């Protein structure tokens, strides 16, 4: 598919303790592989997928150096943002950034992104040309000027076109047995009682990777998405994902409906019924 490396930073101001906490998670595609928690004693970058543990001590040392630096950068950020918005030190506020690189089929950067948010709302974002910024309000224009003055745009662009894609490609080889294996959903359909003139069919897709999947019900080949319940895709706990789709059918009419699954690790789209 179009593979990606992404990081997610959450900085949270903590009034009672008079400090803040910075948490970072790194992903490759749908797979978490590193974490950093400014609360941990002697905080370090830490493995969260087995295949990243083959990185030697220099990788862990230098990733730790950055996260410790950026952790304190974001602590200053939280106080500046408090000033910009005429906010007291009574409440806790959240300051997030996410950034990453998508890999195109030519080994080249498909799309790079870097954005920031404050208390849940978009604050400033790197434009798609990786050369300019878009600020959301008055406060973010202060930040935009500072980053224009200091030429931050092409530091992000360089990372995003260089080290981001380069490490992504190492990670993809290091963990090719898992990252580059498309695992198929194990599927089955169950029946349960509902209401008056109602019987629910629930079509399960279990233990699949990656996260993207398509589940649909059909009566005589026409989509039933108006009257169907589709749960958000959820993690299994072992690195795989789970999802189901249920609908209410008239009692005795079950065989007229089918469940349709497309997943990247499936030869053909699968069609299954109630058995």
């Amino acid at each position: 598919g179009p593979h990606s490396l992404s990081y997610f930073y959450t900085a949270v101001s903590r009034p009672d303790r008079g400090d803040s906490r910075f948490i970072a998670v790194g992903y490759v595609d749908d797979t978490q592989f590193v974490r950093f928690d400014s609360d941990a004693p002697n905080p370090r970058m830490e493995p969260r997928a087995p295949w990243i543990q083959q990185e030697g001590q220099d990788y862990w040392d230098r990733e730790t150096r950055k996260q410790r630096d950026t952790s304190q950068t974001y602590r200053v950020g939280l106080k500046n943002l408090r000033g910009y918005y005429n906010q007291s030190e009574a409440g806790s506020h959240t300051y997030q950034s996410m950034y990453g690189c998508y890999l195109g089929p030519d080994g080249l950067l498909l799309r790079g992104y870097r954005q920031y948010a404050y208390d849940g709302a978009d604050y400033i974002a790197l434009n798609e040309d990786l050369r300019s910024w878009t600020a959301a309000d008055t406060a973010a224009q202060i930040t935009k000027r500072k980053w224009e003055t200091a030429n931050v745009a092409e530091r992000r662009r360089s990372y995003l076109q260089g080290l981001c894609v380069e490490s992504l490609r190492e990670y993809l080889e290091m963990g090719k047995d898992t990252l580059q294996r498309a695992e198929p959903p194990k599927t089955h359909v169950t029946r349960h009682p509902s209401s008056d003139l109602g019987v629910t069919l629930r079509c399960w897709a279990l233990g699949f990777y990656p996260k993207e999947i398509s589940l649909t019900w059909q009566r005589e080949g026409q989509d039933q998405s108006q009257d169907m319940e589709l749960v958000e895709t959820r993690p299994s706990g072992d690195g795989t994902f789970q999802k189901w789709a249920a609908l209410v059918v008239p009692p005795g009419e079950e065989q007229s409906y089918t469940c349709h699954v497309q997943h990247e690790g499936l030869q053909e789209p699968l069609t299954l019924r109630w058995d």
Binding site: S97, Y99, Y123, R156, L163, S167
Partner: peptide
């Protein structure tokens, strides 16, 4: 590998 983030908001 993470980007180096230096400049303040």
């Amino acid at each position: 590998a993470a980007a180096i983030e230096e400049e303040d908001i």
